[PDB]
Design a protein around this ligand. Sequence first.
Ligand SMILES: Nc1nc2c(c(=O)[nH]1)N[C@H]1C(S)=C(S)[C@@H](COP(=O)(O)OP(=O)(O)OC[C@H]3O[C@@H](n4cnc5c(=O)[nH]c(N)nc54)[C@H](O)[C@@H]3O)O[C@H]1N2
Ligand SMILES: Nc1nc2c(c(=O)[nH]1)N[C@H]1C(S)=C(S)[C@@H](COP(=O)(O)OP(=O)(O)OC[C@H]3O[C@@H](n4cnc5c(=O)[nH]c(N)nc54)[C@H](O)[C@@H]3O)O[C@H]1N2
Ligand code: HEC
Ligand code: HEC
Ligand code: SF4
Ligand SMILES: [Cl-]
Lengths: 792, 108
Amino acid sequence: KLKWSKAPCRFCGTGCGVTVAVKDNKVVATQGDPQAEVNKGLNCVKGYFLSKIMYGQDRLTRPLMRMKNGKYDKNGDFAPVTWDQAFDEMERQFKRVLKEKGPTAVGMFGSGQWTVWEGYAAAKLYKAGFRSNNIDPNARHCMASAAAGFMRTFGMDEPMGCYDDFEAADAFVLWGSNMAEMHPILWTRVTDRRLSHPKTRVVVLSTFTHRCFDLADIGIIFKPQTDLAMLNYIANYIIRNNKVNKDFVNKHTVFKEGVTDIGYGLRPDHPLQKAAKNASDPGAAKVITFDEFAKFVSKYDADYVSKLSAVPKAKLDQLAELYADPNIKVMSLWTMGFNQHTRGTWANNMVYNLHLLTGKIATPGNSPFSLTGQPSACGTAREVGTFSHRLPADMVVTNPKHREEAERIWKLPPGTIPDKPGYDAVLQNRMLKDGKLNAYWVQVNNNMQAAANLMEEGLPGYRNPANFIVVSDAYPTVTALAADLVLPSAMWVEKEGAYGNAERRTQFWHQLVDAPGEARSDLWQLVEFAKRFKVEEVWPPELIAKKPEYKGKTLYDVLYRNGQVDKFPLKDVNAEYHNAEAKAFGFYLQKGLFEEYATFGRGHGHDLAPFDAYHEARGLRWPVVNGKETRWRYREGSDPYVKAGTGFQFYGNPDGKAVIFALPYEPPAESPDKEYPYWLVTGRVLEHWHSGSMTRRVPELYRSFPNAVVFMHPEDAKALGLRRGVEVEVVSRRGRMRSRIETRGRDAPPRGLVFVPWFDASQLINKVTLDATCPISLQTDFKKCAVKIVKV
Amino acid sequence: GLVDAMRGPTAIANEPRAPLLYPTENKMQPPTIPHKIDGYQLDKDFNRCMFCHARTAIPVSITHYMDRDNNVLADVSPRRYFCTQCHVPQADTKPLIGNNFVDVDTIL
Ligand SMILES: Nc1nc2c(c(=O)[nH]1)N[C@H]1C(S)=C(S)[C@@H](COP(=O)(O)OP(=O)(O)OC[C@H]3O[C@@H](n4cnc5c(=O)[nH]c(N)nc54)[C@H](O)[C@@H]3O)O[C@H]1N2
Ligand SMILES: Nc1nc2c(c(=O)[nH]1)N[C@H]1C(S)=C(S)[C@@H](COP(=O)(O)OP(=O)(O)OC[C@H]3O[C@@H](n4cnc5c(=O)[nH]c(N)nc54)[C@H](O)[C@@H]3O)O[C@H]1N2
Ligand code: HEC
Ligand code: HEC
Ligand code: SF4
Ligand SMILES: [Cl-]
């Protein structure tokens, strides 16, 4: 009676497989997929409520446009309109802005919860169609430091290990990851390894105590940002105790020293930016020797590091010894504590240094493993390259050979792709406020809630009368409330999808149900809108003169009906499932997109299997070469790209070697002071996803954790005259929010620090945070700034 | 018009009064925990839940005693040890908005 079909979980980058039961157009149940290798049948509480996430009573079903006196008005209340009406106004607004200001004044803010084909369609629309690089995603707030860290150390993105490392590690080292709540099924694999093989050690480092400490053998609370000094201490330890894997280092690594004093990614007239010496080229580095590297880290001794970090020397040593001991297989894990960090690219480099010095990489259990947060920050944002500097498969717009290769695959005139990186996430809000980004489309994110410094940048940027803001969502959100046009979107299994998880596993799903009302997928909206633009309106004449076959053609024709993206006909669609977009445009759009996109990575290290293979499997891990997935990269015998006889080949780098970097501790952008004497850390809880727009509309998840709270040390509550349950304002120099004190909760911070989760749309903690970023990756540090706490 | 019930009526620029912390209610999806769990130890030294729910309160089902290969073991699987990844208590308060889910439970 039920029809059960496979899909990845809609939520975290773990990428659990689920099976989904449908009857009469409704998801009636889901279950953890017992045949999926990632989770073998388990989910967490979020996964187990997937059957409720599409059914909030206020699901968007019609376009809503601000209207006054019968026409679009910025000051108008939202009124329902047709799809043609919505797209007419969008078309007017985009064309007006393009003629007056050009493509640097249009933009898109996308998502690592886009399906792979959504992100690819949006990248073509902006980079090849509008000729704008102002497309960037919420994964900018997330994995940008990790991807910069990979490109610097390895020359290619994403982990070289895989989830199988959890069954082989002898020591897990969590560098601020709260896996117990944020990658629950991976933490179950940690817990299984540890309880079943009890010589295994679990080391948890954090700026506050949380549920991971319930398993930890060694728990380390450290001062925000002083992880940089701890990582160097370990490197020094390995060297001073003669535990370098010298053959590995000589064969497979080189050494660089990075430029320092690189500022904090603030507006250029901010005093911190003016103060910095090297903000202009903050990723520069020079070649050095091993010995210069050993000298550099020798400054990071126990006296300096233990005082700076507040971690006792005995613990720094227990930790350093697991890294050093050649017989211990070490899996290091990190998430936003390393990446949302004003030196988080360096921290990424620095944890790879520990593994490179010892040769503990790319083999089972010996695994520096960057955890990804969103379900498709990897499969979509990073691999498709939906970022202001990117092209697909690690390519960059600044490289002329990369632009040539995109223009070849996309059948564009030479010189079509813009060569200068466009506006990244943080800069998009600053340019909106400054009225320089005037037509803007947000899809599958809630960036008004999610971006730091809401009151100074994002809210006045969205409400600026010079700008026109379109938001595609499934539900009302504060982002949609700040927009001018809201488009009702089809979500999760209302559309055929692909998501790529933290271990390079791309997982497909069919469309299993039909969206309510006139909700339509983000994919449909992008490709439909592209019909509204002729090449003569969006391309300089000299490009049309080089491909004159395109005269008078629309972007829909150039980008989507190009002989490639439309080469698979309706008869290729599996007739047992709907496919709304295929029916809408007249060909198998997802398959054509995927196969054209897959041309970028095939034979270049990022190989995706044939489209149909993913509808048959429970994911496959890239590179998929001759039908076989790859579990360990860069290791001979595991990765088909590695030359025989080399042992290891980091073939992202021209000499095949990984880079070890000498980089210092530098302090946060904003630390506590006399006026604002507490650290504010922000983040998540197990039961809610991100902005809460999905989870906090599920009755059981709302009731499990109805409101955000200020987690506070009991001695700090006593010093402030507070008790559990009293209301406070949390206040920074930027803004304020009101919430209740929790001195007895699952997060127990040290004195001087509070933790506030960001899932509650009535408690917008991103009014308080600072949009300072790592200057290399442009990723915001939401994990530390200075606040005071005042009674209401 | 357009309202976000997860925020309530307050414009983005303003700051709503926070509700009280709600007490926890006393009284196939993982069942919710129909009792308070404040102060219950759940760590590698002691699993308070197993104190009443061991197959030795309604006991855990045999699935909870299964490893990754579906071998039934003589004690709770490490994979199920941290109960609160899947089972959650509930505040004694109504949902913010309706939800049109259906459980299979009630449609076969
Ligand atoms: N339940 C749930 N899970 C999710 C999500 C969700 O919304 N809910 N979202 C997913 C996404 S996209 C992401 S990015 C991840 C986030 O996963 P995490 O990064 O694990 O979780 P957060 O709660 O964002 O961050 C809290 C951690 O930041 C660490 N931290 C703070 N400052 C520092 C520092 O200076 N150094 C280091 N090293 N650590 C620091 C603290 O130690 C704390 O453990 O979760 C993913 N999984
Ligand atoms: N203070 C603070 N801020 C943070 C973080 C932090 O740790 N602290 N974490 C940062 C990080 S790592 C990340 S990943 C971001 C996450 O921030 P966002 O991605 O902005 O947050 P989400 O709530 O996941 O937004 C997803 C949106 O997609 C909508 N929706 C669901 N399905 C669909 C669909 O198929 N189509 C469309 N159009 N809409 C859909 C949902 O209703 C929701 O509004 O937050 C960043 N912001
Ligand atoms: C005895 C002092 C208990 C402790 C310790 C824990 N639980 Fe419990 N639980 C207890 C009773 C008497 C009942 C009601 C009878 C029943 O089985 O429902 C429960 C109920 C649950 C449930 C609901 C099971 C169902 O509805 O099918 C769950 C999921 C549950 N309890 C979980 C749970 C957890 C995770 C605990 C540690 C934090 C825990 N219980 C401790 C008695 C007692
Ligand atoms: C997810 C990986 C879970 C973990 C960890 C724990 N439980 Fe569970 N439990 C889970 C599900 C999906 C279900 C329903 C289906 C099933 O396998 O039975 C349950 C059920 C229970 C029950 C009810 C048993 C019954 O006969 O109906 C109880 C009392 C219960 N679970 C308790 C419990 C305890 C104490 C756990 C920690 C040791 C625990 N569960 C972990 C999913 C998950
Ligand atoms: S661990 Fe992540 S992927 Fe798995 S069920 Fe929970 S939210 Fe989904
Ligand atoms: Cl607020």
